[PDB]
Design a protein around this ligand. Structure first.
Ligand SMILES: CCCCCCCCCCCCCCCCCC(=O)OC[C@H](COP(=O)([O-])OCC(O)COP(=O)([O-])OC[C@@H](COC(=O)CCCCCCCCCCCCCCCCC)OC(=O)CCCCCCCCCCCCCCCCC)OC(=O)CCCCCCCCCCCCCCCCC
Ligand SMILES: CCCCCCCCCCCCCCCCC[C@@H](O)O[C@H](CO[C@H](O)CCCCCCCCCCCCCCC)COP(=O)(O)OCC[N+](C)(C)C
Lengths: 175, 122
């Protein structure tokens, strides 16, 4: 359905085999499906279409909110409380967005596992690989901040990691 | 030690120097003045209670005098307090101005250049 973007929530093209009966016995599932369509689905679609005609008579919109980009904690001076406040709010919003990115990737992984059946270990390699990278980046970014996290502590963690990387790169160059 | 007891040019028992007239007077609806009036009203209620009179309606002239006296004293008390804090601020700013080598203006680094230790929570 046009509700969601198919590029961010993909699925295979849904190959469905045609019915190829071999026996002459009646199929009870077909009779029950016809009964369900005639007794259940049709009144549901009628009620839904009535609801949609009532909705179309009144149309209004709600807008996704756009937020400007503000300077981050790195550009703030030591005791400039207002820039620190704006940088921290922007950092918190980015943290929430990253959580939801990981959520989207996890939903892809779960849907792949359910869809592929007994061949999930092989047919979900791409989803597992995407989740591994996203999980590694999220863990590098926010792991171990603890309660009372902030943009300053995240910056200190990143600086410590870059110092470790620089020392490790200097160690390798001496060989 | 007395910080301002002997400030130069201070009149011994004045309670309100002339320079204090340069400050905005407290508004008559000042929440501190309203609390002084509330204190006067409570004093009047307790006066009725101790004397064994109907607490809320015994003497309205006496209760009114309690409220009025508390508000009247509180107004001048607030004026003196505000003036004294203004004097403290004036002296502190003047002294910082006159001793630049004791309050040196420091160029401030940004958080991108400061190295804070990170302590993981785990
Ligand atoms: C951040 C807080 C914000 C608000 C602060 C609130 C805190 C309290 C308020 C401030 C202090 C108030 C002091 C004045 C009251 C004293 C008078 C008194 O004693 O009460 C008796 C009196 C009853 O007498 P009566 O009705 O004439 O006849 C019955 C006989 O008197 C029959 O009387 P009796 O003598 O025969 O009865 C015997 C009784 C007699 O014993 C007493 O009466 C106790 C009196 C308490 C002494 C208060 C000490 C001073 C205040 C300190 C409070 C500390 C605050 C910090 C928190 C800790 C609280 C302890 O003895 C006992 O029962 C033994 C019990 C022992 C228990 C120990 C606990 C006692 C202390 C607790 C105090 C708590 C507040 C008291 C509430 C008011 C009463 O009570 C009242 O009627 C007056 C109460 C308040 C009047 C309200 C009128 C206002 C009208 C509405 C105006 C609308 C405004 C907005 C306008 C726009 C509208 C549209
Ligand atoms: C429990 C609360 C305390 C109650 C106190 C009694 C209430 C009644 C107020 C007393 C009336 C007399 C004061 C005002 C009359 C004239 C004052 C003037 O003549 O004297 C001046 C002095 O003014 C007084 O000091 C101000 C009196 C104000 C007292 C209230 C302050 C209470 C502290 C805050 C608690 C909240 C109280 C609120 C009341 C409901 C001179 O100043 P100075 O000669 O140079 O200082 C002498 C002492 N030195 C030199 C050592 C510093």
């Amino acid at each position: 359905p046009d509700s969601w973007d198919k590029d961010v929530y993909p699925e295979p093209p849904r190959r469905t085999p045609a019915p190829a009966p071999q026996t002459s016995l009646p199929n009870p599932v077909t009779y029950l499906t016809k009964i369900f369509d005639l007794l259940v689905d049709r009144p549901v679609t009628l009620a839904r279409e009535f609801i949609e005609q009532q909705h179309a008579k009144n149309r209004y919109y709600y807008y996704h909110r756009e937020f400007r980009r503000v300077p981050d904690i790195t550009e703030c001076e030591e005791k400039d409380i207002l820039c620190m406040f704006e940088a921290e709010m922007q950092w918190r919003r980015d943290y929430k967005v990253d959580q939801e990115i990981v959520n989207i990737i996890q939903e892809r992984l779960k849907a792949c596992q359910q869809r592929e059946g007994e061949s999930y270990r092989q047919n979900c390699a791409k989803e597992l690989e995407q989740f591994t990278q996203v999980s590694k980046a999220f863990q590098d970014r926010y792991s171990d901040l603890g309660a009372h996290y902030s943009a300053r502590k995240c910056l200190a963690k990143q600086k410590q990691r870059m110092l470790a990387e620089r020392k490790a790169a200097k160690e390798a160059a001496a060989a | 030690m007395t910080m301002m007891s002997g400030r130069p040019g201070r009149v011994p028992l004045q309670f309100l120097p002339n320079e204090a007239r340069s400050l905005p007077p407290p508004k008559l609806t000042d929440p501190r003045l309203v609390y002084m009036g509330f204190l006067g009203y409570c004093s009047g209620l307790i006066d009725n209670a101790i004397r064994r009179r109907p607490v809320v309606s015994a003497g309205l002239h006496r209760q009114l005098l309690y409220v009025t006296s508390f508000v009247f004293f509180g107004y001048y008390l607030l004026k003196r307090q505000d003036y004294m804090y203004a004097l403290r601020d004036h002296d502190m700013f003047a002294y910082v101005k006159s001793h630049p080598e004791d309050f040196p203006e420091k160029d401030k680094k940004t958080y991108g250049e400061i190295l804070e230790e990170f302590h993981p929570v785990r």
